[PDB]
């Protein structure tokens, strides 16, 4: 019985590790940040379109 | 007096041998019954674990 419990635990942990890059909050959070930085930059570029065109 | 003590010894010894023989038969039947039930327990436990 004890072996069976630990075996299940192991199986569960293995499944979680294999799918962490797309599922875990930590990794997903990093991707969000990178995307927000670029958004802001593009907003700025669009706001100064006239000046940039003139240049 | 020696004849009386010998008669007592004979009675006790007879009782003893008779009891021991019948007790061994019960112990064997009992252990067999316990093992059979224990085996049923083990099969149920394995099935429950797999379902979980």
UniProtKB/Swiss-Prot annotation, chain B:
Signal sequence residues: none
Coiled coil spans: 25-52
Entry's localization field: Cytoplasm; Cytoplasm, Cytoskeleton, Microtubule organizing center, Centrosome; Cytoplasm, Cytoskeleton, Spindle; Cytoplasm, Cytoskeleton, Spindle pole
Record's subunit section: Component of the HAUS augmin-like complex. The complex interacts with the gamma-tubulin ring complex and this interaction is required for spindle assembly. Associates with microtubules. The interaction with microtubules is strong during mitosis, while it is weak or absent during interphase. It is unclear whether this interaction is direct or indirect.
Biological function: Contributes to mitotic spindle assembly, maintenance of centrosome integrity and completion of cytokinesis as part of the HAUS augmin-like complex.
The family this protein is said to belong to: Belongs to the HAUS8 family.
Protein name as it appears in the record: HAUS augmin-like complex subunit 8
Lineage, highest ranks first: Eukaryota, Metazoa, Chordata, Craniata, Vertebrata
């Amino acid at each position: 019985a004890e072996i069976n419990q630990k075996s299940l635990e192991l199986e569960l942990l293995r499944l979680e590790k294999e799918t962490a890059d797309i599922t875990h909050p930590l990794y997903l959070g990093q991707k969000h940040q990178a995307l927000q930085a670029m958004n802001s930059h593009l907003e700025a570029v669009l706001r100064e379109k006239r000046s940039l065109r003139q240049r | 007096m020696v004849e009386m003590i010998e008669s007592q010894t004979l009675l006790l010894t007879y009782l003893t041998i008779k009891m021991q023989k019948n007790l061994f038969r019960l112990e064997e039947k009992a252990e067999r019954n316990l093992l059979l039930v224990n085996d049923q327990k083990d099969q149920l436990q394995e099935t429950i674990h797999m379902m979980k």
